[model samples]
Target: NSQPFKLDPKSAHRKLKVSHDNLTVERDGSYGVAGNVFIDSGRHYWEVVISGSTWYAIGLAYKSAPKHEWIGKNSASWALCRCNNNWVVRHNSKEIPIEPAPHLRRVGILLDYDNGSIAFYDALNSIHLYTFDVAFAQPVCPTFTVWNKCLTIITGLPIPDHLD
Candidate 1:
């Protein structure tokens, strides 16, 4: 079960896709994570689609009495991968040095839409590293299993009963 499955990179499809157009705006313009976001557990990867000229945020959360709170807000690690004509990893909002100039756009804390903020612990283990204001016209899919091993996607805004 530990062995990763070989999935056709092209054959793979999105488990869940949330469009900004389909969202309902609340008083604060915040929304709750849709119910469709999920993974098969055994799969090695999952993908999310965020269209260009749009904004989004993806993170891990545990289902609790409140909606769902991001996993390890002040003490967790995560990674982001972007694909369009090429593939690139946006780690901590810094482009991973790669070849062929992977068509990297502005990557950082996405604040405008009230989305795209990643908070996690750093290597120094003293203070947590936070990245915000990331801008991408294409999709930004995040993946990580460092902590409790649960992957969560948080978008829109946090619901009243949901956990942070």
Candidate 2:
């Protein structure tokens, strides 16, 4: 016999709002963003300010089943899909390889604009896949948009240094 059931939209929407504020619950629970979501996983996600500083980022992918692991040898992998543009991944001062997988649903790329390199991390193992260096100075604003195909400008007041 088949069981009869349905999802509650009101309940789901409420959960989404709450989960947006608390990301930890989203990771452990059935829904929510696990890490930084980006377009063009091969490009730089954020721009740097210093010439000799290092930056690290964590990557994450999603799984539907309760028992099946989301990230692993046979499950899922992260790769930088750069069919048109080329960049470098760097660690300290060394360059690393960035495998290309243009069909992946999710991946992450952390770029160090100062030293001119990029780094790819495994969303499942949280290990460094590789690094490569480029030749570009940091931008003054260092702006980044998620590429949702929407053209909208979101602005707000700058946060105060000290708040009482």
Per-model lDDT: 0.27, 0.26
The 10 consecutive residues of candidate 1 with the worst lDDT sum are 23-32
The digit string of per-residue lDDT tens for model 1 on 1-164 reads: 12121212221113222234422211111122323333223211222223231222334332321231222222222333333343323433444422323222222212222344433221222222344343323322223211111122233331211112
Summing lDDT over every window of 10 consecutive residues in candidate 2, give the lowest-scoring window.
145-154
Please, what are the lDDT tens digits per residue for candidate 2 over residues 1-164? 11111111222212332233222111112221122222222233321111111121122222321111211111121223222233233223233345533222223345444555545543323445565444532221111111111111111212111211
User: What would the C-alpha RMSD of candidate 1 be, to one decimal place?
Assistant: 16.8
Rate residue 55 of model 2 by lDDT: 20
